[PDB]
Amino acid sequence: NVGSLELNNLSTAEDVATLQNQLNKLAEEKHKRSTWKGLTFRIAVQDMWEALTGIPTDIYQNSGRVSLKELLTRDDRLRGLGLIFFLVAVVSIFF
Amino acid sequence: RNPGLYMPLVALSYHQMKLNFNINNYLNCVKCNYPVTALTSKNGANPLSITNMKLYTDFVFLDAPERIRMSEIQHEYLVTQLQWQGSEPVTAPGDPNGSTNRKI
Amino acid sequence: QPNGSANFTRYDSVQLQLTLNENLASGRVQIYAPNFNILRIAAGMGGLAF
Amino acid sequence: FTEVKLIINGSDRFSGRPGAYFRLVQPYEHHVRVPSKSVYVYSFALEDADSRQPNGSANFTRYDSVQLQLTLNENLASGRVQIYAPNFNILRIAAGMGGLAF
Amino acid sequence: LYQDPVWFQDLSVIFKRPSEIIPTRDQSDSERINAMVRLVLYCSFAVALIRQNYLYAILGLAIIAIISLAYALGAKKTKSNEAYGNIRPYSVKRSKKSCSKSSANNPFSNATVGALLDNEARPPACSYDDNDMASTMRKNFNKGLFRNLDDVYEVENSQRQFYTMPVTTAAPDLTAFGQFLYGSKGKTCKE
Amino acid sequence: GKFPTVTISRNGDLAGPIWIEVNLPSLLGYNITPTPAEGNTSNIAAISTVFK
Amino acid sequence: GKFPTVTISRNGDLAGPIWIEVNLPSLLGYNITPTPAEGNTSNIAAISTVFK
Amino acid sequence: LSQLVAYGAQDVYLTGNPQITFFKTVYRRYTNFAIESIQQTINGSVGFGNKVSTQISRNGDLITDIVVEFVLTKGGNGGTTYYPAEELLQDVELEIGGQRIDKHYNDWFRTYDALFRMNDDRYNYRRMTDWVNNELVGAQKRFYVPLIFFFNQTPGLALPLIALQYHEVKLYFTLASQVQGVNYNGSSAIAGAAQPTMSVWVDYIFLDTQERTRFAQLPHEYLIEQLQFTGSETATPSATTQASQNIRLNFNHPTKYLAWNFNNPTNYGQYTALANIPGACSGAGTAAATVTTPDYGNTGTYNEQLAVLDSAKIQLNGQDRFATRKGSYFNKVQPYQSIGGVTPAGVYLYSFALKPAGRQPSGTCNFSRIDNATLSLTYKTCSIDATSPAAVLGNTETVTANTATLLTALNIYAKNYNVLRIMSGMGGLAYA
Amino acid sequence: AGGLSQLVAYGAQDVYLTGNPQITFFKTVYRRYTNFAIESIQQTINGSVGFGNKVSTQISRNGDLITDIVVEFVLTKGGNGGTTYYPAEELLQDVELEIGGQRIDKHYNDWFRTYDALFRMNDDRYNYRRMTDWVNNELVGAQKRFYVPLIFFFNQTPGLALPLIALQYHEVKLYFTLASQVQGVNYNGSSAIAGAAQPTMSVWVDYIFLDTQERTRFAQLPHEYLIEQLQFTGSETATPSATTQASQNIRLNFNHPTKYLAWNFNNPTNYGQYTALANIPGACSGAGTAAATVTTPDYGNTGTYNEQLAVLDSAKIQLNGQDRFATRKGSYFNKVQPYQSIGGVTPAGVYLYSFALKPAGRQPSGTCNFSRIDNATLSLTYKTCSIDATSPAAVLGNTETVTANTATLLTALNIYAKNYNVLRIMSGMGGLAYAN
């Protein structure tokens, strides 16, 4: 009985698409849950990929003029610093 | 008479610019041979009205970036205006009621 | 562009001496004096000041 | 002309004004001399005779359709109205090669 | 319109560009926090270098986190740092002047009736170029509006007519205008 | 003898040149009221059909 | 002596062959104004109803 | 209006669609509002040939219907006037914030009337704008000329002045320098003619709090109508040929319809030839008939024999938009199937819309995407001696009155769709 | 290319018209429909029909819902063409609708004329005239069947048809009071016509038949109907003859949300005369010749669209002593509002002030709550009635503020208001929701 309008879906979508709105937002929900589940405690082997993404991109973040700490570390990078666990295990094996 | 001084009406929202016009009288602006006291239309009794007076202001329209800057930025313009005064140079017209040395 | 001015705001008394010819009729001398002011526009408001 | 009005893309560019306006007033304000001949002009720019500095222009390249309406006096002979329109371009010279750029 | 110089808070990497400031003076609160960060970092790193135990740097970073977290969380929202009229008594130290940012309902912050809605006292919509609000204004104007793709300097959908009015508050702030035209001149000759 | 005023509309940004366009009537058609001697005035071409 | 222009509209996807179709008048119905000396021209059948 | 829309559960789960019996009307519950009419102040002297304007005062929240009223005297007897008030209101311009939204001409009002209103409604309009009871010289009457702008036509398009806190809203009114049967009679001036008295009345809508608040704070868009106007000289030969003429059109928006007429500028509303038949001349039917002067009280006719259009086609980008139609199609058939009223001779319509008389878009032609739109006309041969009914009332379809060649002006109208946009206390158009 | 050129040359300006289409114009949608049948039957009239008599009927329960009511009359004409004016309408002077003994609606012949003057148009106004008058220049002795459809809320709105089946314990009755005089039929002005026949009358009711389930629902379920009502008041007019434009303030003693007000001024002598008589064509008996008078109307043409024969100069409405709108000239209420709000043409002498956006609509669209107003007044200014009605020069060559001296005969002011109320029907009984 009333008109309620959703402005955007994290990317402004003009009121032209009809089913593209459902497909896009279903893909959005799928991506969000995929990232949540692959970003929680339960990880199998993805730590290697996260570390390999962390190091070069963490270094490159300072190759820009600035990079906010909320983005230098929280952009899927915090566990990307999980390789320090590997290196400390290695040296503790040594030392 | 200077684009640099065109009144920035855009920045004057609470001070409208107005013109007050003193239009001369009817029995003026005519220089005939006979001592006319009034002039009237042959057709009807129209007392020499002005057929049509219009005022045309040439406005400048600025692109939006300029409009916004003109609206928001304070302005200091150096402008020229005039003062004037009247006087009484009787100048001793035969009658001993003055002299040729008049200070104003 | 301003090219000089006389600052009449500091002239308490100014007299113009006009020595007239002898053949004048009784009339008027109008004197005009264009001058400089600063127009100060701010906050949607106008006005002329210094 | 008793009145002249320019139409740009179907709309009036100005309220129509008497021919005398275009004949005498416009050049007084915008040109060096007033022809004092029945030559009518209209500017899209402020104060010039080229003046070695652009002072405004009308980009007719984006006027899909332009018409100029002439309200004619009642005592004219059949003949021509020759309309001129000085405009801007860029002389484009490089490495010995010339040509005029649009 | 009132303007202030640029500063930033300890996030990003500003803590190195204007380096070698240790303790606060005539600085913004963000700048003061940055200066405290510089103090702690240099002190802890120097202490770690003098006594090579590699843990004084860790404690320095930890106390950096403590100070930054305290500043981030404990900020009091009760700020009314709005400049208008003759007096600005709330604070004399460096601070960011309040701006009424452009909004979806009011793209140009013209204060048509938004002032009577909730604000009552509405901070002025600050300059067109202050905080990149030009991009936000253009985005808000181009919300739900289709362009013909024949104008990449868009004027076709009538940008020019729309603008910010000279005053964006409930009152014209006549006192500031008068002080602009007529300076106080402090102690004058007649005094 | 009148003192009309004009408010310049804020329907543009800048107030440029101002011109007053005045349409005045031909003066010969008006009579000289005292009728100095030879008479007031009579249109010849438009009226007075006694003339051919 | 004129310089007309044409904008080719998007009335299809590819703009192929272009032809100029020109309808010109016959010129024997026009006079040579210097006057060559032998009366220029006159239509015999259409006018000059003296002829049968 | 272009944002994606969806409903919450409260409008789906807690409701549904009730079944409605034809004979049980369920009326809609609605907002609280009231209507007032007040006079606006006119800036500028009122007189013939003068241009005056109003700034509309913020005396309500929304505006709809606007009526210009005039008091006119009559300079001659019955049969001498033709819509004096409409002729008088020569050029009406709608401006928001200094920006033009729409522009109507006296000829448009007459063309509009000819196409869109009917029967008693056009009769009522006639007596709002003219003298209809054969009154006499010296009589003085008040006339009303309603405006026909998109917002005058419907509550749904009311101008939200409440949302236009910082923009002036104006109506400019040019008054005709000459009005037939009032100021001038044919070419002669009417001595002693009085100047008109003018005032402009604007209605206002007063909204109650809930939607007043929404109109005041929310951004708005409206589909609006705009009139586009252009024109040209006509080719009207008296003999040996039927002239053709290509008039390039100059329009730029989704167009609901195109309309035009063939006018004699001498006499307002004369869209046909004059002839010595009843109603087609001053004095028609007798010795005193003047074939060069109309029956001013009856200048319109439904006799297309006196019109000059034989045939026409409209091309878009050089492509014929329809197969060539006769002038009678545009005059009688088009408005029959599209509007349902009757249009007099000399006035023509071609529509793009299914319903040109309605407000809901129902098909448009977008001229912003047409580089070469042309109206191609074929004229009737204007060879009939207009003073002889024997030929005027008894000749073939391709020929008209010799007096038809006085219709030297072509008036071409287009009514288009644009979007009016109001934001931050200001308005303007979505598209140029 | 034809329609293809238009169809293809698509731009941004079209997105707002054709993007994400919501509707199709070439394939329509049909609403849920229930099967209906209509039957038209006679009702019994209780009482003696004749001039000046009052009779009544009762709607027989011969259908489920009531659609319309048509009163048939048989009249003879005592005069020639030009002597009668809507005689069937004049004849049916006072019609009252009653449910359960309560008054729901009350109409007067003048209302029926006023209603036609404001709301009917073009061919239906002509066809109306055809059914209530003689329009083909019929002569003395002619006899015709005339019909007067009723204009009550259930007669005009198919959606308000009375649920008689939901009213099994209430009778629904209609009173039909007839006029003592009809012009050109029973009287010529004040003079009785010898041999005048008495009218014969029959009342026709159009009934709806419902199917089994819908009938059950109407009879058993409670219903509420939004209905229109007419309210009426009136008084003597302060019409000036000279030297002044008299004003008059009449209290608007009305008491419900009102869709509109309407009024006229009339000569009580002549039904439908809302204007001054004059010696101009169609404005009086004998206009144009030596025998012309301005005391006897052209009865076949008492109506006119010439407002200069109308008395009202200007009018204003005040509520609780406050101006509701600025004073307007009478032609505002005669020409402009009808144009703006109804469409068609309103005869001179008839005025409308609408509160509603659509006074011709059934759907409420703004009302004036007289129920919450203590002092509602209509302030009227009259034209000076100084014109010699017998001189076309004076009648036709005059100004706005004056009218014919014969306008002083328009001594009665009739003010109507159309309001809403709610008709509540439950458990076989009903009446209206709001008092006053």
Burial of I318 (0-12, 13-18, 19+ CB in 10 A): middle
Q: D and A: touch, per 3+ CB pairs < 8 A?
A: no
Q: Which candidate from I122, I159, I326 shows the least CB-CB separation from H38?
A: I326
By DSSP bridging, strand H381-384 and strand H399-401 are: parallel
Instruction: Flag if G10 and H372 touch (Cβ within 8 Å).
Output: no
**Helical residues (DSSP H) of chain D, grouped into ranges:** 19-20, 26-30
Instruction: Flag if C44 and B14 touch (Cβ within 8 Å).
Output: yes
Q: For D22, phi and psi rounded to 5 degrees?
A: -75, -30
Could you give the C-alpha distances from H357 to H150, I215, I360, in angstroms and in order?
12, 41, 19
Q: Does B89 touch chain D (CB under 8 A)?
A: no
Kindly tell me the sign of the dihedral angle through the C-alpha atoms of H326, H328, H331, H333: negative
Show the CA angle centred on residue G20, arms to residues G14 and G22, nearest 5°. 155
Nearest residue on chain C to E85, judged by CA atoms? C43
Residues 41-60 of H with CB under 8 A from F: 43
Beta bridge partners of I202: I72
Q: Which of H238, B65, I76, B15 is nearest to E160 (CA)?
A: B65
- Structure-block tokens of residue I277: 């008589």
- Structure-block tokens of residue H212: 């007043």
In which region does residue B94 sit, left (phi positive, over 0), alpha (psi from -120 to 50) or beta (all else)? left
Q: Experimental method for this entry?
A: cryo-EM
Could you give the C-alpha distances from H84 to H72, H81, H197, I343, in angstroms and in order?
8, 6, 13, 22
Q: Does C2 touch chain E (CB under 8 A)?
A: no
As a whole number of angstroms, the distance between CA I298 and CA I272 comes to 11
**Which residues in G lie closer than 8 A to residue H319 (C-beta atoms)?**
11
Q: Does F11 touch chain D (CB under 8 A)?
A: no
As a whole number of angstroms, the distance between CA H170 and CA H175 comes to 16
Show the CA angle centred on residue C16, arms to residues C12 and C21, nearest 5°. 165
Q: Determine the residue among C10, C37, C39, C45 to mutate to test chain E binding: the one whose Cβ has the most chain E Cβ atoms within 10 Å.
A: C45
Instruction: Flag if F21 and D18 touch (Cβ within 8 Å).
Output: yes
Could you give the C-alpha distances from F47 to B43, D74, I313, in angstroms and in order?
11, 22, 42
Residues 191-220 of H with CB under 8 A from E: 213, 216-219
As a whole number of angstroms, the distance between CA A35 and CA H296 comes to 82
Number of Cβ atoms within 10 Å of the Cβ of H381: 21
Kindly tell me the sign of the dihedral angle through the C-alpha atoms of A51, A52, A56, A57: negative
Nearest residue on chain E to I15, judged by CA atoms? E146
E183/chain A closest Cα distance in angstroms: 43
- Structure-block tokens of residue H229: 């106007």
Q: Does H368 touch chain E (CB under 8 A)?
A: yes
**Neighbours, chain F (3 or more CB pairs < 8 A):** B, D, H
Q: Which of H169, H183, H24, H28 is nearest to H99 (CA)?
A: H169
I17/chain A closest Cα distance in angstroms: 11
Instruction: Flag if B12 and C45 touch (Cβ within 8 Å).
Output: yes
Percent of chain G that is helix, strand, coil (3-state, to 5)? 0, 0, 100
Does residue I406 contact residue I426 with C-beta atoms inside 8 Å?
no
CB environment B4-36: b (16+ within 10 A), e (fewer)? eebbbbbbbbeeeeeeeeeeeeeeeeeeeeeeb
Q: Which candidate from C24, C36, C41 shows the least CB-CB separation from B91?
A: C24
As a whole number of angstroms, the distance between CA F48 and CA A77 comes to 106
As a whole number of angstroms, the distance between CA D96 and CA H288 comes to 82
CB pairs under 8 A between G and H: 11
Q: Which candidate from B13, B43, B54 shows the least CB-CB separation from H191?
A: B43
**Neighbours, chain B (3 or more CB pairs < 8 A):** C, D, E, F, H
I326/chain E closest Cα distance in angstroms: 28
Contacts 24+ apart (CB under 8 A), H89-94: H89/H145, H89/H173, H89/H175, H89/H176, H90/H174, H90/H175, H90/H176, H91/H51, H91/H172, H91/H173, H91/H174, H92/H68, H92/H147, H92/H171, H92/H172, H92/H173, H92/H174, H93/H170, H93/H171, H93/H172, H94/H149, H94/H170, H94/H171
**Which residues in E lie closer than 8 A to residue H164 (C-beta atoms)?**
112
Tokens 């917002």 found at: H151
Residues of A with CB under 8 A from a CB of H: 1-7, 13-17, 21
G34/chain H closest Cα distance in angstroms: 30
Q: For C41, phi and psi rounded to 5 degrees?
A: -105, 125
As a whole number of angstroms, the distance between CA B38 and CA B48 comes to 9
Q: Amino acid identity, residue I11?
A: G
Instruction: Flag if I13 and E147 touch (Cβ within 8 Å).
Output: no
CB proximity list for C3: less than 8 A, separation 6 or greater: none
As a whole number of angstroms, the distance between CA E6 and CA E17 comes to 13
Q: Which candidate from D17, D21, D29 shows the least CB-CB separation from F17?
A: D29
As a whole number of angstroms, the distance between CA D33 and CA D24 comes to 10
Could you give the C-alpha distances from H273 to E33, E130, H327, H388, H403, in angstroms and in order?
90, 67, 15, 13, 5
- Structure-block tokens of residue I129: 């005239």
- Structure-block tokens of residue A76: 């899927």
Instruction: Flag if I19 and A18 touch (Cβ within 8 Å).
Output: no
- Structure-block tokens of residue H153: 């036509």
As a whole number of angstroms, the distance between CA H69 and CA I326 comes to 14
H387/chain F closest Cα distance in angstroms: 28
CB proximity list for I275: less than 8 A, separation 6 or greater: I283, I304, I306, I309, I310, I311, I348, I349, I407, I410
Nearest residue on chain E to C37, judged by CA atoms? E181
Nearest residue on chain D to B6, judged by CA atoms? D46
Q: C and A: touch, per 3+ CB pairs < 8 A?
A: no
Residues of E with CB under 8 A from a CB of I: 146-149
Tokens 């300097």 found at: E153
Instruction: Flag if H4 and A5 touch (Cβ within 8 Å).
Output: yes
Q: Does F18 touch chain D (CB under 8 A)?
A: no
- Structure-block tokens of residue H14: 């807690």
**Which residues in H lie closer than 8 A to residue E104 (C-beta atoms)?**
219
Nearest residue on chain H to E165, judged by CA atoms? H166
**Helical residues (DSSP H) of I174-240, grouped into ranges:** 212-220
**Which residues in B lie closer than 8 A to residue D47 (C-beta atoms)?**
3
Residues 152-181 of H with CB under 8 A from F: 168, 170
Q: Does E11 touch chain A (CB under 8 A)?
A: yes
Kindly tell me the sign of the dihedral angle through the C-alpha atoms of H288, H292, H293, H295: positive
Could you give the C-alpha distances from C43 to A12, E97, E174, H201, in angstroms and in order?
36, 17, 8, 35
In which region does residue I35 sit, left (phi positive, over 0), alpha (psi from -120 to 50) or beta (all else)? beta
Residues 8-37 of C with CB under 8 A from E: none
Q: Does F27 touch chain B (CB under 8 A)?
A: yes
Q: Does D45 touch chain B (CB under 8 A)?
A: no
Could you give the C-alpha distances from E71 to A68, D67, E34, E65, in angstroms and in order?
16, 67, 11, 10
Beta bridge partners of H202: H38, H66
Q: E and H: touch, per 3+ CB pairs < 8 A?
A: yes
Start-to-end CA distance of chain F, whole Å, equals: 42
- Angle in degrees, 0-180, between the axes of helices H119-129 and I122-132, rounded to the nearest 10: 100
- Structure-block tokens of residue C24: 């004048």
**Neighbours, chain I (3 or more CB pairs < 8 A):** A, E, H
As a whole number of angstroms, the distance between CA I203 and CA I69 comes to 7
Nearest residue on chain F to D46, judged by CA atoms? F16
As a whole number of angstroms, the distance between CA A16 and CA I248 comes to 61
Q: Does H318 touch chain B (CB under 8 A)?
A: no
**Which residues in D lie closer than 8 A to residue H249 (C-beta atoms)?**
65
Beta bridge partners of H415: H227, H257
